[PDB]
Amino acid sequence: KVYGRCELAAAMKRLGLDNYRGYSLGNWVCAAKFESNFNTHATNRNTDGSTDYGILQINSRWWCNDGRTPGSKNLCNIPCSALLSSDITASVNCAKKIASGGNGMNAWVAWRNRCKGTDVHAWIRGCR
């Protein structure tokens, strides 16, 4: 799947992501095109023996299982798969918990690349 920006972003609101660890959802939204381009089934394999997955584009060897990655942890104890689904909320639910770490959006430098220091409400406006 691949979700439409607004069609998708008030969905995060549903998850209250907005102000998840003080994080405005636009910042979240962003990461999705930048790290997800809002594609549910988009998944990027690394030259590090693993792929980030989902739209979230998070690394398996630390979070999910696709039974593939040598020495992977899957601390999410879940399917790497269950996330690229045309309904990301699941991955979201895991991604969200994953921010419980100190680092924050930092873990998506792509975020720090784009989403960091940027006008995140630039997403919010003109969509209910």
Side-chain angles (χ1 to χ4, degrees):
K1 175 62 184 135
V2 225
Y3 272 107
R5 203 165 127 241
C6 300
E7 148 250 63
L8 190 53
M12 292 161 158
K13 149 204 194 320
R14 307 248 255 356
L15 285 175
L17 288 158
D18 183 30
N19 276 290
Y20 178 60
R21 266 170 124 314
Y23 284 108
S24 169
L25 201 52
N27 283 121
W28 297 96
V29 164
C30 161
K33 158 54 70 137
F34 285 144
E35 290 284 34
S36 89
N37 85 114
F38 312 152
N39 182 296
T40 81
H41 68 280
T43 33
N44 310 303
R45 164 144 238 129
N46 279 278
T47 321
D48 65 24
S50 192
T51 302
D52 270 340
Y53 281 89
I55 209 163
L56 270 36
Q57 288 313 323
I58 306 156
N59 184 219
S60 85
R61 186 89 89 330
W62 310 63
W63 304 109
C64 68
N65 179 27
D66 66 339
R68 220 162 202 151
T69 34
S72 177
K73 304 310 201 157
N74 174 242
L75 273 41
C76 194
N77 190 349
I78 66 161
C80 288
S81 317
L83 307 188
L84 284 177
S85 39
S86 157
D87 201 301
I88 53 178
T89 67
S91 37
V92 184
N93 284 291
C94 190
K96 194 203 273 244
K97 48 188 70 93
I98 296 148
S100 306
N103 304 292
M105 275 188 156
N106 278 333
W108 288 269
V109 49
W111 148 70
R112 168 178 46 264
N113 289 348
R114 328 290 33 281
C115 309
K116 196 176 166 208
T118 176
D119 176 355
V120 356
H121 282 90
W123 306 102
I124 66 156
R125 313 180 243 82
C127 308
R128 141 262 291 142

